[PDB]
Amino acid sequence: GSHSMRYFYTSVSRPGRGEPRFIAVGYVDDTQFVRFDSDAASQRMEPRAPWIEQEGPEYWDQETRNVKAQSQTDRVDLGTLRGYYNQSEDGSHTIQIMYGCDVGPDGRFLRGYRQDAYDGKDYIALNEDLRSWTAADMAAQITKRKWEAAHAAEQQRAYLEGRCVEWLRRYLENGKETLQRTDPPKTHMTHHPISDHEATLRCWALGFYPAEITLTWQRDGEDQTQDTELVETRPAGDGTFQKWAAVVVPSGEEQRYTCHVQHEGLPKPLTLRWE
C-alpha cells in the first residue's frame, strides 16, 4: 500500500516578454488537491479537494508565498535561457518542474524526485541518492556546477525526506476516504462489425480508481497482441478513470477471444467474453 505526492509547475514565457503564465497543481495518489494560476484574479493557492479545505490560513499563506517565489525564480531563468540560446523575442518557451516523494505502507520515505525541463527537453534532475545531479548539455551544466558548489542537493533532500513525507502522511489521513480507496472498474464488452468478414470487440472498463489497470486480449488460451488497440487511460471528471481495449477478430470467432482485466480494487482478475 504505497502512495506518492506530486507537484507540477509550469512557467510559459510570453511572445511579448510579458508576465509568464504560472500554473501549479498537486496530486496525492493520482488525486489533484491544490492549484495556483497566475492568470486567475485570486493569485492565491486554491483548494481542489474536500479534505484539504480544512487547513488553516497560515497553511495557505505559506504555500502561496513559496509557490510565488518559485514563479518569480522561473521567470528570471526564462529570460536568461532566452538570451543563452539566442531564441526569438517573439517566441514562447516553457520551464517545467516535477518534485515529490513516495511512502510505503508504514508511511516512511521510499523515493524522492526533483527534475526540471526546458521546452519539453530534460534540464537537470536529482538522482535517487538525493546527493548528485544529472544535467543535460549547455545551460544545465552551468546550473549543475552552480548547484553542486552551493550544496543545493542537501536542502532538496531535507524537503523530500521531511516536509514532503510529513504532509503526505497528513493528507492520506484527512483524505483516507478518497486517497486510500479502491473503486473497482465496471466492465462490459461491445461488438462493432467492420465488414461481412471482420469485426471489432471493444472491452470497456469505466469508473475505476486508481488509474492502474491492465487490459489484455487472449485468443483461446494464448496471449493475443496482433491487431489489437489500447487507448490511453482517460479521466472521467469525477475522480475515476476510463480505459478500453479492442481487437479485430474474424466473424464467427468472437467467443474465442477473452478480455482480461486486472485492477488494484478487484478481488480477482476479471475475464470478459461474448459478442
Binding site: 507537484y7 501549479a24 498537486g26 497553511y59 505559506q62 504555500e63 513559496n66 509557490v67 517565489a69 518559485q70 525564480t73 528570471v76 531563468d77 536568461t80 535561457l81 543563452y84 518534485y99 526540471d116 534540464y123 537537470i124 545551460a139 552551468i142 546550473t143 552552480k146 548547484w147 543545493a152 536542502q155 532538496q156 531535507a158 524537503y159 516536509r163 514532503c164 504532509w167
Partner: peptide, 10 residues
Amino acid sequence: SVLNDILSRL
C-alpha cells in the same frame, strides 16, 4: 506542502 528552498538555475 510545496518546496520551500527555491533554487535559481543559471
